[PDB]
Every structure is written in C-alpha cells, then in structure tokens.
Design a protein around this ligand. Structure first.
Ligand SMILES: [Mg+2]
Ligand SMILES: [Mg+2]
Ligand SMILES: [Mg+2]
Ligand SMILES: [Mg+2]
Ligand SMILES: [Mg+2]
Ligand SMILES: [Mg+2]
Ligand SMILES: [Mg+2]
Ligand SMILES: [Mg+2]
Ligand SMILES: [Mg+2]
Ligand SMILES: [Mg+2]
Ligand SMILES: [Mg+2]
Lengths: 50, 203, 104, 119, 155, 116
RNA sequence: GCGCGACCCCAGGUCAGGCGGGACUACCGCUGAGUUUAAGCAUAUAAAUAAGCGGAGGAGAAGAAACUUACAAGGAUUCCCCUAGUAACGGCGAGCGAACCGGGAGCAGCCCAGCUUGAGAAUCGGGCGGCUGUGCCGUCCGAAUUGUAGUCUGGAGAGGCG
RNA sequence: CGCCCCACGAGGCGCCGUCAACGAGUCGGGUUGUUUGGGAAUGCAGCCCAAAUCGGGCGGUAGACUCCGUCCAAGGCUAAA
RNA sequence: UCCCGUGAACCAUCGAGUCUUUGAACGCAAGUUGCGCCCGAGGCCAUCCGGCCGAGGGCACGCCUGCCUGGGCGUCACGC
C-alpha cells in the first residue's frame, strides 16, 4: 500500500539493509567461514509475510 | 475471662438467640458483595484461637461462596468416553468450601497472606467465612516473633497451594496412622515413590 | 546423644533388645537428671515412652549412671567452674570418641 | 585528554569540555560524508571521549548526591540498594533473630553445654 | 451502605427478638443515667499525659529516698475480660453494660451472670459514651469495685 | 434534600508531597542539538536544492519534529528557518529540508560548514 | 438556628509500602481423558497418569501421635533395604497391591488461644529528632480494653514452703 | 587470651495437696460421588442431622453390654537424611 | 606517547555509570509513533507581580497502615 503504517515502514526499512552482499573484507578475515550472504531475499520470490 | 462464655454461646447454634442474630446477620451478609473488608471479627474468640490478634496488619475479610457440589463443565453434559466417566450431576469438588473461600480471598488480595479462615454464617445457598489475612510488609508484623514465620518467602500463597487449616483437612493430613499413611508427604509423592522401579547397581 | 536399651515389639522380635529413642521421665528423675537439662548434655528424652517394668527401668538406669560416670562437661565460661562441671586437669585430655561408645 | 585528569576538574569546565567535544563530533560527521582517509578515525576517539566525560559527569554527580542523601534520610529509588527482589524482601538479621521470651529464657538457662566422654 | 443499615433496624423491628436480646433496649433512665455518669466522670482513669507525671515525679523517691510512699488510687475498671474476672470473683460493686455492643454475643450473657452471681448491673445507652469515660473509642463494659468514703451514701 | 438522587459529595484531595523524589538525577537532554542534527546530507540532489531553493538538507533524529528542528537550527549555525519539511527516507533515517529566511544565504551557511 | 462522640462506608495522583508476569528438571493443590489389556466389551485396566489450570523454594511437602500394636510392647517427619508381588482388592477374569515389625541415613523439638497487672497497657506502629545505625533512644500522634505484652500448652501448669 | 563478676527476678530440684480451665456447623452419624489395597465403606467432598467434659478418637467384620490396651483432634512453626 | 608508564589491548574481571520503543506494562488506546490531563527546572514580554515557549517528570488496578476532606437519626449524649 501507498498508505502504510509507520510500523510497517520502519520494519521494511530494516529489511532493506538486511539485503546486501557481504563486505569483501569479511572473506579475507582470518579463520572465516562466510562464503556469501546466505540470508538474501528477493522481492518476487520470498514474501516478507507482513 | 469472657471467651469461654462467648464460645459456649456459639456452641449453642440452634438456640433462639443465635437463630435470631444469625438470621439477621445472614440477611446483612447477603446484601453485600462477596468479598468485603470488615474491621473486626464477629467471633473474637474463634478468631483468637486461630491466631488473630488485635494488632495492626491482621485484617479480616468476609468471603461468600455458593454451596452445592461441582457439576462437570462440559458442553452439553456430553462426556466423550467410557460409561464410567459419563456422569455430571452428582460429582463433588475435592476441596472444601472453607478452602475455596481462602483461595478466593488469596487471589483477590495479592499483597497479604492467608493465615486462617472460619465459618461465620450459613444458609441454603451461600456460606460466609471470615478469612484472617496478614500484611507481611508491615513493621508490626515484622517485629512479632510469633508471626515472622509467615514473612519468609516459602509461605507464598499457602491457600493456593494447600497449606492452611482447610488445606490440611481436605488433603487428609488430619490423621497419622493407617487410614492416613498414603497422604504423607502427599498422595502424589507416595504414588511416585511406590511406582519407582528401583534398579540397584548390583541387582 | 545416649539411647536406651529397649525391647522390640511384635512376637517375632520381642526378645531382641535395640536402641530406642530416649529415656523416659521416670528414668531421668530416678537417675537424678532434670528434664530440660537431659537433652543438653547428650541424653535423649522420649516423653512418649512408658515404663512398664522394673527390669527395663533399672536396665536403663545403669546406662544413665554409666554415662554420668564417664561424662565430662566443659564450663560455659573459661574460669568459672559451677556445679556439674569438671576439673581442668582431666578436661585437658578430652577426645572425640568415634563409633558406638556404649554397645547394646 | 585522560580520565585521571578528567575527574580533577570543575563542573563548568567539565561541561564546557563536553560541549567542545560534541562540536568536534559534529564536524567529523561533517567530513565523514565528503572527505575520508585520516580524519575518519578521530570520530572513534571523539565518541569515546564524549563517553568518558559524560561518565565523569554522572559518576561524580551520583557520588555527590549519595553524600547528600547519605545522612541516613529517606533514600530515593534510583539510589537505594538493588540486589534482587528476594533480597529486598527478606528480613533483616534483627528481625530473623526475633525469638520468643520463653525461648530466650530457654537459651539463657539450659544452653547447649560442651561435652566429651571417657572422663 | 445507607440502605442496608436502615433496612437493618427495620428487620430487627419486624422479627421477634428473643428475651435474651430484648432485655436490651430497656435501659437506665435519663435522670438515673446522668446521675450515675456524674460519678463515673468523677472516677475516671489516668490519662497518658497524666500518667507520665506519676512515674516521672517518683524519680526523687526512687533515686534518693529508696521508699515507696504512694497509695492505692480508686478508678473505674473496664475491659470485658477484666470485668468478667472481677464479676466471677465477686469483687464488683456495680456493672455498667452498653446496650449497643456489636457483636451482641459479647454482652448477651452478662445479665444472667450478673443476676445469678448477685451483682447490681445496669444497661446504659451508648458504648461510645462509656468509652469516653475511659478515653477509649469503645468500652462495652465498666464496673465500680470501690468508692471513696466521702461518697458511699450517694453511691 | 430536593433531588431524589444522591451524588458523591465534593471532597478535598491533596496534591503529591513526596518525602523523597522517586528520581534523583535530573534527566539529561538526550535530544540536544547534536543528536537532533546528525549531519547535512550532501548528495547532488540536496546540492542543487542549496542554490535553487535556498534550503539545507539534513539527516535528523527520528524523534525530532519540526519544532525542535527549527529550535536546533537556530542554536547551531546562528541562523533561523523560515520553513521546515520532514520526510522519513526508506533507509530509516529522517531527512529534513530546512528553508531559510531570505535574510540568510544557504550558500554562505553551507560554506561556513563545508559542503561544496 | 447547633456544636459532640462512636459505628459503618466514601473519595484522595494524600505519606509510607506489599501484589501481579517469566523458567520447568525436581516440589505442592485442583482438574482430568482415551489409544491399550482383558484375544470381543460395558466394571476393571490404561490411571488416581498425559493434556488443562494455578503456587513456591534451594530444595518442596510432611512432622512431634486423637500412632501402631497385642508385645517382655515400642514412640515425631522424611528416604533406602526387607516386609512383598504378600494380606487385601478384581466381570475373583485380566490383573492390581500397600502397611506394621526389623535394619540402616539423620535425628530437635517447639509456641500459641483459654482463669490469672488492675494501686498501673506493663504492648505495638507511624511522624519528627539524635546516635552507636539490619537497631537503640526521646517527644508527639495513633492502634488497642470487642485485649497488645507477660505466665501456660497437658510431657504439664498455677500456688505455698525450702 | 583481656576487661567485665554472675540474685534477690526467672529457672531447676524436694514436698504438699487445693485448683488444674486444653481449639464447634468442628468431631461424629446418615446418604451421594470420587478414590483407595482398605474389604457392613481408606481418605476426601457435597447436602442433611449435629455433640460431648466421670468425656472424646482408635484397637482393620456391622451390632449392644462388661473389661482391658492406647491417644487427646477440630490453631501454628521446625533444619537433617 | 601507546612503552622503566597514571598504561596498548575484539584482554580478563567486577563494585562506578548509561540502559532507545515496547512487553506483567501501568494516562486512554493501538493495522494510530494516535488522543489527552497535571507539576515543572529555564527564557520572553509585561494585557498586572500574569501569561506564552519549555529540559524533564508524573497520571493504571485492586490492597495495607496512617492522615485529610466527607456521607447516613445506623447508636447516641447534648442543644435551639
Ligand atoms: Mg509528512
Ligand atoms: Mg480390548
Ligand atoms: Mg486384540
Ligand atoms: Mg474393539
Ligand atoms: Mg501435566
Ligand atoms: Mg517447609
Ligand atoms: Mg518371600
Ligand atoms: Mg490402580
Ligand atoms: Mg477426580
Ligand atoms: Mg467412600
Ligand atoms: Mg508446616
């Protein structure tokens, strides 16, 4: 909706930031296991359910 | 000493004088809420012998409860099961009404602790009990050694947990020999004990 | 604390003596030891038992006398030695007996 | 600036240093968005220095007010001792030591005497 | 609250009060009650401010004199238990019962006890007015055990 | 009585007179000017706004409102705002457009802070 | 045209204070099934259990005989072994099933109400003040005589003599 | 280890014989329901009846009489295993 | 300068502090950053020596002890 409540706007703000590739310098960091962001979300595939 | 006089006069509960005063008190009680603060015991002797004192922090609250048995709350009297659990109308609650009154006053009165409760008046539909409550944050109770034992944390909601006079009566703790050996420490404790399969190491 | 020689119940074990719970009031009185003081100095008291036999009473009275014979009691204070106390010279060798000190 | 010297200041000087540090924090966030390289780390230092100077403000203030109300007056809730709710609702040792008159007599008389055997 | 307390007196009028309770509402007359209360006012107990001085001025007699010079004061006795003990030991010369004690069972048995231990008893009107005699809020019973030699006839 | 209805009489109550304040410390102003104006946004869009509309574009605290935004832009920068508009960006931060009175020049203010 | 006292009940953002919710191993109270077994099934069994609803603590509960026994009797509570798969209970079918005695672990017994200062509430709380500060003390109010403190608890006790 | 010294109050012990006070819609009984190993009814609970003071509860088969063994409920606190 | 010292550290540890919106959640509600009421440090001008803008902070429910203001011929004594 274009008329979204502030709660939903605030909580859709965070799921914006939650969707970015890992910083490249995470991969070179010692004793690391992070291979990619295994929690990405695409808007056509996974609906946030709210 | 007057308490012997008044106690015997309350022993004679079918006399004309007690019938009069008890009917008029029953009407007055029936015209008030179920749980009502009352300033002083109507039965000073009975209150005293159970540990009431004319001291700050001991309050008296009159509690009303309905009479009759506990009729099973199922949606139309339909109890899905074998015929031997299928009754409704002649089941009896396994806590006495004295305890029910204590467990009403205890819930509504959070900040106070239930000491005892005693019968005051009765009619066809309602029993009236007077519950003695104790205020354990009150300094005059903190400084009385005979009642400090009630300020320790292990005596929370005695009424809700089955520890008062009515509590022990309906728990069947009034008795020690046979006829009462299963109820020590509790019926569930003895059931657990008798059901534990003891497998010793060198069995 | 000290425990009395008593008989068991029950035809199966009537003849077999065992340690009881405490000395009766009659026994404490006749051995000359006050009611409220007996539990103080290591002597149990069982106000619920009844003495039905001289055979039992003198049997336990000999135990009370033996215990008082080989009992030592420290003073409640350091220098003040009141009645019922014991002298320092034999207080100084006192030990902790271990196990059953009066077998039945 | 260091804390050993930062406690040893006056109230006005300490808040004035707070103000200057906060303005510096403002200008470092100014240059965060435009420039970079070498001043981008001073923001960490200025932030921690804000933390130091506010901690000094608050610690010194609450110490002073502990002194002021610690004439054993009524103490406020933010100053009373929080340990746990059970601890606050226990009885003080005098309250626990309350024992009845008959028992006080029974402990004056008839104490637990000290004994051994084989005497 | 008002409604039930008015219906209270209405119901106590309607119902048949038994003789034991109906002995109340038959109180000592106005003139006789006032005349008796004159004397009960003469023989009031000791105040608190008036009780501090009696113990504070014996200081010289206890610290220095080492003697007790005080005598027996004569006051009215009160309290249900104390007065019942006195009446059963027959050291009561007169008993004053408040008509309006709630619960009434505290004073129902008094008249028979008084009568059959042969003690003069009256049921005056006003437990608060009795309480004033002894400075408590409610008294519910009083008694005279002794009077000064200058007031025997009028007692 | 005249009316046959009984109403609760007008009693007298006291205002609170605590014997000890339930809070001792004075609460510090956590929405001070520096938390309420985090930093001027310097994207090309706000850059063009600076000259075309004489407005400075800030990122401001999410609990700020137009009243505090003007009051704060007055204490900092020694300026005043003729008007202020606020929106909440999708990223979460609130963005505020502060339009100056024409006595004050946005280029001069933005050069005295350093944006261009 | 009243001023009084008591009772009972109001409203107070009055002063000072205690309540509510969370965790589930263990613990206390209520409520409370059936699948299953009986080669069917309906009492019984599953089970005085699972689920439901509440309440606490470091343990909880019980506890100082209105006990068991029939003995030469013992002697609070709790737990282990034995009693005992026994007495008993059961469409006497399936099954179910404790206790006393005894041996051990540990053992501690206590306090109220009532007749009992009546030359005299000796008791307790609160405000304020002091100090030595988990309290003590002074003063002023209040609670309380419809009984606070003290003595007493059946093993006793109260009195009187030593 | 040191200073502080324990009473006319309380207790214990011995005797006396006078008092000797002890918990009520509670026990207890009928009937119903549940539960138990508890069987003419093991506890509990509802309703009705409802006390006793030379008495009351037990002694595992209901009943009345005689005797005997035993305990004192209807208030409260209490570690240890 | 953080290096033979008021002293580094994604160090350890814990007593001095901070602890956003909520939630038993407590001003009223809540698909609402919704709608209130009271105190008030501080400043303005003086329509007075009052009012405006406030930093902050309160305002829930039953309950106890006490205190205040009250109600009812419920019981009364004294009075016009
Ligand atoms: Mg907008
Ligand atoms: Mg089958
Ligand atoms: Mg089959
Ligand atoms: Mg089938
Ligand atoms: Mg369950
Ligand atoms: Mg316990
Ligand atoms: Mg065998
Ligand atoms: Mg079974
Ligand atoms: Mg059931
Ligand atoms: Mg039955
Ligand atoms: Mg207990």
């Amino acid at each position: 909706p274009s008329h979204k409540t502030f709660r939903i706007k605030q909580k859709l703000a965070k799921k914006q930031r939650q969707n970015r590739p890992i910083p490249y310098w995470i991969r070179m960091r010692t004793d690391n296991t992070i291979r990619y962001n295994a929690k990405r979300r695409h808007w056509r595939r996974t609906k946030l359910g709210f | 000493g007057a308490y012997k006089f008044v106690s015997e006069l309350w022993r004679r509960k079918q006399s004309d004088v007690m019938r009069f005063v008890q009917r008029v008190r029953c009407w007055e009680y029936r015209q008030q809420p179920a749980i009502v603060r009352i300033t002083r015991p109507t039965r000073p002797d009975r209150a005293r012998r159970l540990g009431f004192k004319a001291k700050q922090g001991y309050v008296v609250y009159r509690i009303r409860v309905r009479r009759g048995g506990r009729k099973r709350p199922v949606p139309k009297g339909i109890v899905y099961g074998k015929p031997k659990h299928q009754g409704i109308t002649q089941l009896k609650f396994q806590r006495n009404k004295r305890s029910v009154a204590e467990e009403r006053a205890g819930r509504r009165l959070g900040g106070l602790r239930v000491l005892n409760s005693y019968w005051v008046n009765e009619d066809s539909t309602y029993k009236y009990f007077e519950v003695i409550l104790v205020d354990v944050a009150h300094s005059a109770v903190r400084n009385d050694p005979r009642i400090n034992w009630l300020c320790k944390p292990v005596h929370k909601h005695r009424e809700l947990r089955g520890l008062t006079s009515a509590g022990k009566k309906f728990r069947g703790l009034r008795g020690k020999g046979h006829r009462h050996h299963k109820n020590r420490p509790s019926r569930r404790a003895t059931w657990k004990r008798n059901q534990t399969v003891s497998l010793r190491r060198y069995r | 604390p000290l425990r009395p020689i008593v008989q068991c119940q029950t035809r199966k074990y009537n003849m077999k003596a065992r340690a009881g719970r405490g000395f009766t009031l009659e026994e404490l009185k006749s051995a000359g030891i006050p009611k409220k003081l007996a539990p103080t100095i290591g002597i149990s008291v069982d106000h619920r038992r009844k003495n039905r036999s001289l055979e039992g009473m003198q049997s336990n009275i000999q135990r009370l006398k033996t215990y008082k014979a080989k009992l030592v009691i420290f003073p409640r204070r350091a220098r003040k030695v009141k009645a019922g106390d014991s002298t320092p010279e034999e207080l100084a060798n006192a030990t902790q007996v271990q196990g059953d000190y009066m077998p039945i | 600036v260091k804390a050993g010297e930062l406690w040893n200041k006056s109230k006005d000087d300490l808040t004035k240093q707070l103000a200057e540090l906060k303005t510096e924090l403002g200008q470092l966030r100014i240059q965060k968005v435009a420039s970079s390289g070498s001043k981008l780390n001073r923001i960490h230092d200025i932030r921690k220095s804000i933390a130091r100077v506010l901690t000094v403000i608050n610690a010194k203030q609450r110490a002073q007010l502990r002194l002021f109300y610690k004439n054993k007056k009524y103490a406020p809730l933010d100053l009373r001792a929080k340990q746990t709710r059970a601890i606050r609702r226990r009885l003080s040792p005098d309250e626990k030591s309350r024992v009845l008159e008959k028992t006080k007599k029974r402990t004056v008389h008839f104490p637990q005497r000290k004994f051994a055997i084989k005497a | 609250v008002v409604r039930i307390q008015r219906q209270r007196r209405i119901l106590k009028q309607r119902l048949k009060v038994p003789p034991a309770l109906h002995q109340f509402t038959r109180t000592l007359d106005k003139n006789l009650a006032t005349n008796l209360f004159k004397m009960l006012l003469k023989y009031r107990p000791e105040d608190k401010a008036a009780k501090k001085e009696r113990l504070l001025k014996r200081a010289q007699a206890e610290a220095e004199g080492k003697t007790v010079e005080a005598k027996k004061p004569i006051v009215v006795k009160y309290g249900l238990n104390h007065v019942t003990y006195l009446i059963e030991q027959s050291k009561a010369q007169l008993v004053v019962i408040a008509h309006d004690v709630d619960p009434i069972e505290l004073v129902v048995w008094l008249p028979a006890l008084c009568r059959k231990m042969e003690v003069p008893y009256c049921i005056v009107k006003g437990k608060s007015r009795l309480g004033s005699i002894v400075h408590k809020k409610t008294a519910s019973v009083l008694c005279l055990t002794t009077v000064k030699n200058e007031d025997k006839l009028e007692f | 009585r005249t009316s046959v209805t009984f109403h609760r009489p007008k009693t007298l109550s006291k205002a609170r007179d605590p014997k000890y304040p339930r809070i001792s410390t004075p609460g510090r102003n956590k929405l001070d000017q520096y938390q309420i104006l985090k930093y001027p946004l310097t994207t090309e869009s706000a850059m063009k706004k600076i000259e075309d509309n004489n407005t400075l574009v800030f990122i401001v605290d999410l609990k700020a409102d137009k009243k505090k935004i003007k009051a704060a832009v007055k204490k900092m920068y020694d300026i005043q705002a003729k008007k202020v508009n606020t929106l909440i960006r999708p990223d979460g931060k609130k963005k505020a457009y502060v339009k100056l009175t024409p006595d004050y020049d946005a280029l001069d203010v933005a050069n005295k802070i350093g944006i261009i």
